Amino acid sequence: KMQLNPESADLRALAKHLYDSYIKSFPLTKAKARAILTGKTTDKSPFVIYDMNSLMMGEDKIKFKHITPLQEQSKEVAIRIFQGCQFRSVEAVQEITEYAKSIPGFVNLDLNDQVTLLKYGVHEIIYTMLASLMNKDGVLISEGQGFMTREFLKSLRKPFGDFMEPKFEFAVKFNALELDDSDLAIFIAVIILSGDRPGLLNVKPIEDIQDNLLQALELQLKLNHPESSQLFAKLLQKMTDLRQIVTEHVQLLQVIKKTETDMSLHPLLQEIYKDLY
Ligand SMILES: Cc1c(C)n(Cc2ccc(Cl)c(O[C@@H](C)C(=O)O)c2)c2ccc(C(=O)N[C@@H](C)c3ccc(C(C)(C)C)cc3)cc12
Ligand SMILES: Cc1c(C)n(Cc2ccc(Cl)c(O[C@@H](C)C(=O)O)c2)c2ccc(C(=O)N[C@@H](C)c3ccc(C(C)(C)C)cc3)cc12
Helix, strand or coil: CCCCCHHHHHHHHHHHHHHHHHHHHCCCCHHHHHHHHCCCCCCCCCEEECCHHHHHHHHCCCCCCCCCCCCCHHHHHHHHHHHHHHHHHHHHHHHHHHHHHHCCCCCCCCHHHHHHHHHHHHHHHHHHHHHHHECCCEEEECCCCEEEEHHHHCCCCHHHCCCCHHHHHHHHHHHHHCCCHHHHHHHHHHHHCCCCCCCCCCCHHHHHHHHHHHHHHHHHHHHHCCCCCCHHHHHHHHHHHHHHHHHHHHHHHHHHHHHCCCCCCCHHHHHHHHHHC
8 A cells, every 4th residue: 555644654763763773783784794795895805714724814813812722623623613603693692682672662571571582583683684794605704804705614524514504595595685774674673573482471462563563664675675576575484484494503503512512611601701802
């Protein structure tokens, strides 16, 4: 229908509010990420890691040194890279949670339901925003200061050689939608307010917030993408694809968390690296 009625102005105002929260909560947006991947930005080119020799030069640019070099160099590299991917994941939760609080009505929910929505929703947000940082060659790492190639990640040890491939194959199909930060801001909020998470108390207040986010998203996509019909429908299938692809990812590293013995990082040691930095 698309009318210029007072309810549409509220859906446009909600999109503006979610976008402003998207900028403050997340440092590296897709707008700046694409500027680095194409060299359009005035900043310096990021350090590129494509082989083992380039990775050794990258570690020398880090203040930390890792004073426990295990003999297995195939494990010294794979395990070290994976824990860098996990320490960054923890800081993303701090940013995701900061953005989740900005969604109208989220704080008014039950506190245990807020945990449940973030519990199962953090992974699906990571999969989405990670696509903004990667292309067909590699992924931007360390707040855009680095760039690790895709084929280098495939050259790691056999268990760690394909934990990023399910994310690259999703990105090439998700970036084809060519969404911008304005579209992603609403789309992230829709994933959080998914009212069918296992263990939700009152589903009624959650889906009521999501239905306004869904209406604000379809209005955003129809206005921002004039040459793309059914883009709202295509994006819903990408959301359901995140469901069955995250369950395969969470079950994948549970084998690593158990068979590597040193993967479940010590809780008190985590907080030391966060507060020092
Ligand atoms: C492998 C890898 C990936 C895929 N990424 C991007 C990434 C990951 C996870 C999420 Cl969730 C994510 O999501 C986006 C949307 C976001 O949040 O930007 C984006 C990395 C970022 C930094 C480092 C690293 O190793 N960096 C060095 C500088 C360091 C960091 C920390 C340490 C200590 C453990 C000692 C503290 C030591 C060295 C490695 C990776
Ligand atoms: C020094 C260091 C430490 C202490 N950790 C945590 C860590 C290591 C090893 C084990 Cl085993 C571990 O687990 C338990 C058992 C433990 O020993 O504490 C925990 C790191 C993780 C990743 C990188 C890295 O080199 N990340 C690469 C991807 C990059 C990223 C970004 C850059 C630039 C910023 C220059 C762009 C350069 C290189 C370095 C370190």
